[PDB]
Design a protein around this ligand. Structure first.
Ligand SMILES: OC[C@H]1O[C@@H](O[C@@H]2[C@@H](O)[C@H](O[C@@H]3[C@@H](O)[C@@H](O)O[C@H](CO)[C@H]3O)O[C@H](CO)[C@H]2O)[C@H](O)[C@@H](O)[C@@H]1O
Ligand SMILES: OC[C@H]1O[C@@H](O[C@@H]2[C@@H](O)[C@H](O[C@@H]3[C@@H](O)[C@H](O)O[C@H](CO)[C@H]3O)O[C@H](CO)[C@H]2O)[C@H](O)[C@@H](O)[C@@H]1O
Ligand SMILES: OC[C@H]1O[C@@H](O[C@@H]2[C@@H](O)[C@H](O)O[C@H](CO)[C@H]2O)[C@H](O)[C@@H](O)[C@@H]1O
Length: 753
């Protein structure tokens, strides 16, 4: 009737009568709602609706907000599609010294508007189709229709007309520098270079005026890299091949660690003989990893400058990238030179901790904290305390994973609900617009998966599908479903082409979609790898490995700029805190200080965090910049996160800072995150830093033929760590020739007591 049973748990199918707990705060109350009733999609788009996309504002707004199908920005309006390109004169880097914020951004301008001869009063723009990274937006006014196909990594906009023909409208007359009749090369008054293409014999008119017209029912627009007729001729070749399908298919080679992704389009010919293929514009995280076999397809001098650096052109039907999955762990092992009694004391101290809210995010942080403590307790021989932590995790998850109370009625809080309209699992209490905007499901549900993965590491029975595993796998499907999932869209959070997750479900911003905590995305992927390994689910594990590895490639480019090629020279910070489709900010979604604008992309620290240490010059450079700005090691907030980060390259320094201040305050205090961030503990901090002191640096040059491992290197001496989730012993082969044997349900070394 009102809930669906899933193993021992359930989800609500009717919106619950929310228990507000006597809280009258309007913000809190408004959070306990649902996503928008109205979805702007045609009747060609059925089933669970895609969210968390670069193009989402087209689905949520009557028209759209500003979008970034790089190299373009575009926006839908009643009058047609505005097209823009941020040239260097449009780009700015601004600093607000007192706020401690920086902003790299362009403009919301219009180079020209793509229009329909029959109307400039479209009623709405709807999603008419989409694939892994393109969208087809349909401007509708009865018989008059204009379908616009566009995407990230597409230097083409394809335009299909019903009951009318093409118009390009400009505020200032453009320079048409090449007139081939049906094909034109033109520049805006401010020297931005474009081209337009119509079928042979359909010639452009209005050359020299503010309005270019064509009788065709099909045109394409290209952004040209240069004012270059040879480039124009190359763009002609693919200007009539409209992208209909686009898939990012991947494989994980467990033996080598290689994650291979092939990006393939299928096009439809708009003139006789049009090739099946396109010109792709690749982002840095793609071309820096281009497969050998795709190199011949590069159009070497075809570059575009965008917010994310330089895009490069590549021609054909497909291209491939190759990445290396580095492994993850369920926890750091027991390899530190800590005082064991001191660590045991901190473990017991952590029993004072409690969640600082009732919503999925604050409860999430708390269960992540307990799940992080439990293996450390096992290591210290405190098995009863470890069991206390896991029992608390079980109590919390067995509550939240049930939608009904003892009487069989729907609960008013601590439950999950399936919104059928969009097709998404929502948790109440909600926060950060997790329900009202479908935000952050990876960030929040990642913590639930962490808790489940830690339970599963000790208790396989609990994790079985007919027990509590079914509900955990439901939460995972919400945020990273495979294809053809009856309840959820494909890989909700992830944008396979941009290479990162997008946190906002709706994308109703003029900067496109955004992601702030890339580390909470990586945490979600890590926990799915662990959960799936523990529960013997290879297909799920491998999908999470693909996500972890691809997301890592985008983080190192766009959040860290480890290669020092992307951020403008005049940008002061050594991190971008929030990445948007159209801009980059050193700023947070809440009013914060200096440390948080770095550390929100580090936290939480867990056994999947070692990707943060692959680039030690970056770790040094970022730390030194933060230290310069603070002016000392007196961190304004979250000191322990800074010490843990510093330990990636200088554990002696991290240790001395930790010794000086870790015991400044006593037990858990929600009002005071100066020393310990509220999702962290003294026990975790002390265990992490001492482990890194003994282990040395992350060594990403060594891979393994199983997925749950790490390799460290201290002055040339390697330490190899494997956790074995199997009932059987395993042998692990490393890429440097090292080979180890691991007993069931154990680390190879540092199991502790
Ligand atoms: O210290 C008290 C102080 O804490 C602030 O809580 C912040 C969260 O606002 C912050 O939320 C992040 C989001 O902006 C986004 O990246 O997604 C998730 C949430 O879904 C979070 O990463 O997270 C940090 C780290 O956990 C918290 O410290 C409160 O906002 C603020 O009012 C309060 O004064
Ligand atoms: O987009 C993903 C991101 O969303 C964050 O929530 C933001 C809200 O913080 C923001 O709140 C607005 C304020 O910034 C402004 O000062 O006032 C208005 C009017 O009250 C507020 O609505 O609103 C946007 C939507 O416009 C939300 O997306 C979440 O905190 C963050 O977790 C999430 O990743
Ligand atoms: O960019 C991070 C900051 O986002 C701010 O919200 C902005 C909105 O007010 C505006 O309307 O949209 C843009 C994107 O087009 C947003 O940047 C928040 O107010 C800040 O707290 C946050 O740092």
């Amino acid at each position: 009737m009102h809930a669906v049973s899933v193993g021992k748990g359930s989800y609500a199918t009717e919106f619950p009568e929310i228990d507000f707990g006597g809280i009258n705060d309007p913000g809190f109350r408004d959070q306990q709602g649902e996503p928008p009733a109205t979805i702007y999609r045609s009747d060609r788009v059925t089933g669970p609706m895609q969210t968390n996309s670069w193009w989402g504002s087209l689905a949520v707004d009557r028209f759209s907000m500003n979008q970034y199908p790089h190299p373009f920005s575009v926006r839908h309006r009643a009058e047609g599609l505005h097209v823009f390109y941020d040239a260097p004169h449009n780009m700015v880097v601004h600093e607000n010294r007192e706020a401690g914020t920086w902003h790299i951004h362009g403009a919301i301008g219009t180079d020209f508007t793509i229009k329909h001869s029959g109307t400039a009063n479209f009623e709405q723009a709807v999603v008419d189709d989409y694939n892994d990274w393109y969208v087809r937006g349909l401007l509708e006014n009865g018989a008059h229709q204009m379908a616009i196909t566009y995407g990230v990594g597409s230097p083409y906009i394809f335009v299909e007309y019903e009951d009318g023909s093409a118009v390009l409208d400009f505020d200032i007359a453009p320079d048409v520098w090449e007139m081939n009749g049906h094909v034109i090369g033109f520049s805006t008054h401010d020297h931005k270079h474009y081209a337009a293409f119509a079928p042979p014999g359909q010639n452009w008119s209005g050359i020299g005026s503010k309005t270019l017209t064509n009788n065709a029912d099909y045109i394409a627009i290209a952004k040209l890299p240069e004012k270059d007729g040879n480039m124009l001729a190359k763009f002609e070749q693919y200007a009539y091949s409209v992208v209909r399908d686009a898939v990012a298919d991947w494989t994980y080679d467990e033996a080598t660690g290689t994650v291979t992704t092939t990006f393939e389009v299928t096009t439809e010919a708009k003139v006789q003989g049009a090739p099946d293929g396109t010109i792709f514009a690749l982002y840095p995280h793609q071309y820096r990893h281009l497969a050998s076999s795709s190199e011949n397809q590069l159009l070497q001098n075809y570059q575009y400058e965008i917010i994310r650096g330089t895009m490069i052109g590549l021609e054909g039907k497909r291209f491939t990238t190759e990445l290396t999955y580095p492994g993850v762990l369920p926890s750091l092992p027991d390899l530190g030179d800590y005082d064991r009694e001191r660590l045991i004391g901190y473990l017991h101290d952590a029993t004072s901790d409690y969640p600082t809210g009732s919503d999925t995010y604050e409860l999430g942080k708390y269960i992540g904290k307990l799940a992080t403590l439990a293996p450390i307790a096992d290591q210290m021989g405190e098995y009863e305390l470890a069991e206390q932590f896991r029992g608390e995790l079980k109590d919390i998850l067995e509550d939240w994973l049930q939608a009904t109370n003892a009487s069989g009625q729907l609960k008013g809080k601590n439950l999950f609900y399936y919104n059928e309209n969009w097709g998404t699992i929502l948790g109440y209490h909600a926060a950060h617009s997790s329900a009202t905007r479908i935000n952050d499901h990876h960030f929040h549900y990642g913590y639930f998966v962490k808790a489940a993965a830690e339970i599963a590491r000790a208790d396989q029975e609990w994790a079985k599908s007919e027990n509590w595993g079914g509900m955990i796998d439901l939460l995972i499907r919400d945020f990273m479903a495979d294809r053809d999932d009856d309840l959820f869209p494909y890989l909700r959070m992830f944008d396979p082409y941009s290479g990162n997750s997008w946190a906002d479900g709706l994308a109703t911003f003029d900067a496109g979609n955004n992601q702030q905590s890339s580390s909470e995305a990586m945490h979600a992927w890590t926990n799915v790898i662990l959960w799936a390994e523990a529960t013997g689910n290879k297909a799920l594990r491998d999908r999470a490995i693909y996500l972890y590895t691809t997301e890592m490639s985008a983080i190192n480019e766009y959040f860290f700029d480890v290669h020092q090629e992307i951020f403008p020279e005049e940008y002061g910070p050594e991190i971008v805190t929030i990445n948007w489709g159209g801009k980059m900010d050193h700023a947070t979604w809440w009013n914060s200080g200096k440390v948080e604008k770095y550390a929100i992309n580090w936290l939480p620290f867990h056994g999947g965090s070692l990707y943060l240490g692959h680039h030690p010059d970056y770790v040094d450079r970022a730390y030194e910049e933060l230290r310069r700005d603070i002016g000392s090691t007196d961190w304004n907030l979250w000191s322990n996160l800074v010490w843990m980060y510093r330990a990636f390259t200088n554990p002696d320094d991290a240790l001395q800072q930790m010794e000086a201040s870790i015991d400044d305050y006593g037990l858990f205090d929600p009002g005071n995150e100066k020393i310990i961030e509220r999702g962290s503990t003294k026990a975790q901090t002390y265990h992490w830093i001492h482990n890194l002191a003994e282990l040395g640096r992350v060594d990403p040059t060594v891979t393994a033929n199983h997925p749950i491992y790490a390799v460290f290197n201290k002055n040339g001496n390697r330490t190899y760590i494997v956790y074995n989730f199997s009932d059987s012993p395993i042998t692990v082969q490393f890429s440097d020739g090292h080979s180890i044997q691991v007993e069931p349900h154990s680390f190879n070394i540092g199991n502790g007591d």
